Amino acid sequence: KKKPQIKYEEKQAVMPESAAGTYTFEVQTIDGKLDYEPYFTSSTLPWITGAPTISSRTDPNKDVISFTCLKNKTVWNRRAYIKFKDKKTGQYIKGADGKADLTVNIIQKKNENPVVHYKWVDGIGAPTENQKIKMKIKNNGIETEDYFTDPFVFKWKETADTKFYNVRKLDKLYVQGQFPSNYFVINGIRNEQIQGRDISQSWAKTASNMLHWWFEQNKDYIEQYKQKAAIEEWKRPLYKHDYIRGLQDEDEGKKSNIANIFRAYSHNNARGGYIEDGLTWYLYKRDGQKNLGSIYPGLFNDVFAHDTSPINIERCETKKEFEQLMNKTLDNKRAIGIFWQGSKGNRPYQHAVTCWGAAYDEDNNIICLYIAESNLPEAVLYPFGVRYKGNIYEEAEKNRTYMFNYALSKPENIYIDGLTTLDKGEDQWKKWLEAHQ
Numbered sequence: 001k002k003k004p005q006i007k008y009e010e011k012q013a014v015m016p017e018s019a020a021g022t023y024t025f026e027v028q029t030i031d032g033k034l035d036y037e038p039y040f041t042s043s044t045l046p047w048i049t050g051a052p053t054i055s056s057r058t059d060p061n062k063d064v065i066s067f068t069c070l071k072n073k074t075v076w077n078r079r080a081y082i083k084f085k086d087k088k089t090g091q092y093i094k095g096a097d098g099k100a101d102l103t104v105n106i107i108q109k110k111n112e113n114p115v116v117h118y119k120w121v122d123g124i125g126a127p128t129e130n131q132k133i134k135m136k137i138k139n140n141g142i143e144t145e146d147y148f149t150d151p152f153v154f155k156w157k158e159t160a161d162t163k164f165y166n167v168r169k170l171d172k173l174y175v176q177g178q179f180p181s182n183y184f185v186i187n188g189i190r191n192e193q194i195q196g197r198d199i200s201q202s203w204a205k206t207a208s209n210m211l212h213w214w215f216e217q218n219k220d221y222i223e224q225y226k227q228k229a230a231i232e233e234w235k236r237p238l239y240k241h242d243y244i245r246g247l248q249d250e251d252e253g254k255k256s257n258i259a260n261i262f263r264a265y266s267h268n269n270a271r272g273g274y275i276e277d278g279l280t281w282y283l284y285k286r287d288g289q290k291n292l293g294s295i296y297p298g299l300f301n302d303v304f305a306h307d308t309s310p311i312n313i314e315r316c317e318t319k320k321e322f323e324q325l326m327n328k329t330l331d332n333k334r335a336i337g338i339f340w341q342g343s344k345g346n347r348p349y350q351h352a353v354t355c356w357g358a359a360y361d362e363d364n365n366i367i368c369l370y371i372a373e374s375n376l377p378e379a380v381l382y383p384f385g386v387r388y389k390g391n392i393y394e395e396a397e398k399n400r401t402y403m404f405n406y407a408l409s410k411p412e413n414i415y416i417d418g419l420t421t422l423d424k425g426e427d428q429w430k431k432w433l434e435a436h437q
């Protein structure tokens with residue numbers, strides 16, 4: 001007698017809808033009914049209940065295989081794989097080429113109607129519906145007539161009433177021949193005239209946004225500092241954060257005193273800089289930052305010298321590391337700088353941006369970030385989708401947090417290497433105020 005065989009066209013994926021249910025596919029049975037058992041290749045499939053089974057063999061030509069999925073609440077497809085063990089021989093059954101194991105690809109489809117929730121950096125409010133701007137899908141750099149339909153895909157428009165900060169690079173907004181010839185002129189601290197450029201200053205724009213937030217959150221402590229501290233004469237003008245909303249692009253140099261301090265006085269580096277360096281430079285004295293600029297603000301050195309720094313730097317290489325870091329930062333009322341890393345084209349990529357909040361699916365996966373991107377033109381926060389390298393259910397030792405770039409309508413090999421965070425420093429401020437009673 002001939003030995004029975006099974007066949008399956010492996011190019012056909014099995015794609016259950018997002019709803020929970022017991023789904024099925026068919027396996028062709030040749031020359032009888034082979035005694036086999038189906039198995040998932042992973043034992044860490046929390047979204048599948050049990051093993052696959054042969055639920056019908058009544059048709060001589062095919063078996064029905066059943067498997068049970070939980071609802072896919074996430075906005076991502078998720079993958080599982082079924083192989084087949086010959087129960088008489090104990091070997092995995094071969095596929096069409098006689099060498100590879102017969103493998104059926106399962107892809108449960110994404111949730112088309114997710115319920116999303118949001119966490120914003122403390123103290124910046126939250127977008128109103130009128131402040132959320134939907135985005136057109138681009139193709140070959142041209143906007144199509146289609147829009148991104150996921151509910152978290154919106155720009156957060158800056159208005160007179162919004163409370164985030166997004167200082168933009170003058171060197172990116174500038175249009176030669178159309179902007180004012182004095183566009184880059186800064187009136188320095190001794191009323192001296194300075195042409196400050198900022199093409200490589202994403203670290204300093206990110207620091208400036210975070211510092212604007214910090215001056216605002218701590219404004220009552222800073223008022224007490226101005227009243228009670230022995231302020232060095234030359235630094236007195238710097239105890240001030242002005243961020244003037246509603247300006248035209250051609251007036252960006254008149255928008256932010258903090259960003260202008262970096263643009264006038266910070267020394268240049270084409271290899272960029274570090275968010276944490278600019279933050280330290282503005283707030284307290286460290287020898288490492290002695291050569292950052294031609295001045296050293298160090299405006300609250302006697303609050304933070306010899307105490308906890310409110311600045312931290314952490315890295316993340318897995319989904320778990322990224323979400324714990326984001327949640328810890330958001331839940332502890334801190335501001336967020338992101339240092340992106342990867343490739344933009346056939347060239348290395350590094351860039352600092354500011355994060356003002358995150359979107360979450362019903363499983364509390366982080367699915368989108370709201371980014372102040374000093375390279376991008378609009379006076380808005382841009383959504384950057386979150387994508388993770390491989391299986392999020394069976395995480396590998398490295399599963400970086402890649403960015404989907406809705407403004408360019410494309411994934412990019414750009415991932416989040418880590419966060420630089422800025423804490424209010426409430427305990428340090430309290431100890432300073434208690435010592436100045």
Ligand code: NA
Pocket residue numbers: 043044045046047048049050
């Ligand atoms: Na399972």
Ligand code: NA
Pocket residue numbers: 199200202351375
């Ligand atoms: Na750049």
